[PDB]
Amino acid sequence: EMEKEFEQIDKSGSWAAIYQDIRHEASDFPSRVAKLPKNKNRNRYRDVSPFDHSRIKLHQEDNDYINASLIKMEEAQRSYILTQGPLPNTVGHFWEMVWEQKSRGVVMLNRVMEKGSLKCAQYWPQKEEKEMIFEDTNLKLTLISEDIKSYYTVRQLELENLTTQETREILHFHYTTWPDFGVPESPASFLNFLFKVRESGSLSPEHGPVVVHCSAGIGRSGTFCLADTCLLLMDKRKDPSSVDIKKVLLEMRKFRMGLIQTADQLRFSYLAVIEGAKFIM
Numbered sequence: 001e002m003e004k005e006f007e008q009i010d011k012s013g014s015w016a017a018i019y020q021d022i023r024h025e026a027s028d029f030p031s032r033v034a035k036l037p038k039n040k041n042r043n044r045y046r047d048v049s050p051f052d053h054s055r056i057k058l059h060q061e062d063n064d065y066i067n068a069s070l071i072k073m074e075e076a077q078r079s080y081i082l083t084q085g086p087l088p089n090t091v092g093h094f095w096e097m098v099w100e101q102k103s104r105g106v107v108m109l110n111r112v113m114e115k116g117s118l119k120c121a122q123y124w125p126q127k128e129e130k131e132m133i134f135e136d137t138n139l140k141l142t143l144i145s146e147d148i149k150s151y152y153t154v155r156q157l158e159l160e161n162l163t164t165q166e167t168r169e170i171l172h173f174h175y176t177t178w179p180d181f182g183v184p185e186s187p188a189s190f191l192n193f194l195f196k197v198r199e200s201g202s203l204s205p206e207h208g209p210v211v212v213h214c215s216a217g218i219g220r221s222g223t224f225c226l227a228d229t230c231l232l233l234m235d236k237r238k239d240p241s242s243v244d245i246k247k248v249l250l251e252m253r254k255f256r257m258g259l260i261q262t263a264d265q266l267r268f269s270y271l272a273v274i275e276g277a278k279f280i281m
């Protein structure tokens, strides 16, 4: 059981050691499309690339590339798109991916500015009456409503395909209180946020995969998917304690490199799953 394993690693201070075994065991697959010189300005970080086998392809003949990966968790019947925070030049590609994949929710785990630098382009409208048009991808985005709470904001957006005049409602879930350094002290507000995404229907098989991002799409984004999948597996299996976080993380790392960036994020993931299990048992 992971609660016991938690106290062991914690009392022994072995987090950096566990974290290193994960780095050494992790899959390595080609990422040739990401490294093409024509894609250099579609990547926020030169060392964070989608694998070719799991990359999301845009349906535009010109250049199909976006820094985005499909995570498929077969046993949990869960799928997530993990992506980077869009760049000024990829905001149109981001919304094209949301459209093409039939996603219902976007989960954002960063602020636009952190540590005095831009981590993400402002890719949604700030006011109802000021909609955004993405000329490159022929989409219009309107803010319908915004509900600001202490730890997170939920926004209802309307995405319109200008080519076909179809419209869809997208939910934007914005976790606004992840600290600039380190991890939250308590996982309570993060669990509340994760249960709110679940309640919306955004993680349900009747929609395309949820889009999850932070700045690189590997650290905070990784914690989100890892916690959701682990808690789901605990409700599915005859023996809940058969759930090994480290195994689940290694499975997800077959689909996108580097998920969970620090030993602190790993410890936080254990804590979130351990605490979430109480509200699930």
Ligand SMILES: COc1ccc(CN)cc1OC
Pocket (backbone or CB within 6 Å): 075, 076, 077, 078, 205, 232, 236
């Ligand atoms: C909605 O369907 C499911 C989603 C997840 C699981 C988890 N093993 C089982 C399901 O069966 C129905």
